[PDB]
């Protein structure tokens, strides 16, 4: 089997892409974020405190002839951005772009943080890293990929995000006319549970590549770049009104200016993020700065190649017994 | 207004 689904922005920035999800019988649609940066399928529902439901489709279980209640199962999870929810958990049909795995654990929000209840586009979150960091106690589900690769064609899934424009995540086939020359593949550390792989090096605009190995992962789930504070400086230092702002939280730079290119090794080749993704957008509307979409991984811990980066190539998740990362231009 | 998905 395949699945082939549309991913569209929820804002004019490419914060964040949704795709929808049919959950239950009869099938009742939510649009979540696909985040390979965690392994848990959870959703807004009937169960959500009420005062933090606002604006959100949610799901009933009530309603679906084929959910099933996870029998003292319980959930708790929290981001990288300070976001967090729990709740409990029942298994139910789930399809994603005509794929369909029955028997999937879709974990159910008793309660959702603010961030959540304020952003109205997204009805819950499907994990896809590794099932070892799955929240779910005492025992932890296994992820949607994870349960469809028995049935899949090829066990993989690609993703193909756009930019200030609609993509497609496609499960179990490699469409060979969404990108050019050739897919470079590059080994995946499963040790934290991430998609983690190191990339050999960079380049900024038409300057030398520096051959420096940049351990860090792939997250379809985090809107920018973050790279080592040294590899971000380089590139600031060719944008000549850019300054670090400790106010508005990381470097702005006048939207007037022209942004060189950042090009980053995967194997013997490189992927060009063109300068204009770089610009995420003013600071507010209006405004004169823009808000710059490579920024330091100091305080974070770990380097992240987000959207910024992802949206620039056909990104392939090789999910074999011994995993591995693929990047073709596009 | 980004998002960063999991992580203490």
Known sequence: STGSATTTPIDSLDDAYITPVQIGTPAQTLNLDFDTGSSDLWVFSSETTASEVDGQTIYTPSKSTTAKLLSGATWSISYGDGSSSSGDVYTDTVSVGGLTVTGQAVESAKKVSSSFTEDSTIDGLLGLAFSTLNTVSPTQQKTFFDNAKASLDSPVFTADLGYHAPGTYNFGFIDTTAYTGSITYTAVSTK???????????????????????????????????????????????????????????????????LPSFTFGVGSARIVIPGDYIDFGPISTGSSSCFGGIQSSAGIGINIFGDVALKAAFVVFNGATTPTLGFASK | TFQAFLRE
């Open chain 1, 192 to 258: 934290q549970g991430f998609w983690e792989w190191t990339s050999t090096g960079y380049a900024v605009g038409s300057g030398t590549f520096k051959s420096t190995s940049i351990d860090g992962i792939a997250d379809t789930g985090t809107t920018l770049l973050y790279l080592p504070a040294t590899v971000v400086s380089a590139y600031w230092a060719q944008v000549s009104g850019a300054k670090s702002s400790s106010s508005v939280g990381g470097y702005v730079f006048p939207c007037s200016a022209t």
